[PDB]
């Protein structure tokens, strides 16, 4: 429940928090592409 005019975005608001984590994740993807 965000202000009425934002109704459209509950979907994203929903995900935004996962991102932080996502970074430690990516950090690996790159390290892998760069053969350690």
């Amino acid at each position: 429940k965000l202000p009425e005019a934002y109704a459209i975005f509950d979907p994203l608001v929903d995900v935004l928090p996962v991102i932080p984590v996502l970074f430690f994740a990516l950090a690996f993807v790159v390290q892998a592409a760069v053969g350690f």
């Binding site: 509950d10 979907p11 994203l12 929903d14 995900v15 996962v18 991102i19 996502l22 994740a25 990516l26 993807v29 790159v30 592409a33 760069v34």
Partner: peptide
Amino acid sequence: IAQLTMIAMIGIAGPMIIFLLAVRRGNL
């Protein structure tokens, strides 16, 4: 409802930078 599809894109946003970087060059 939709929430899932829109999460998908952001998630594959990061490995895509790795890809767009593979092809072009730099970083190294």
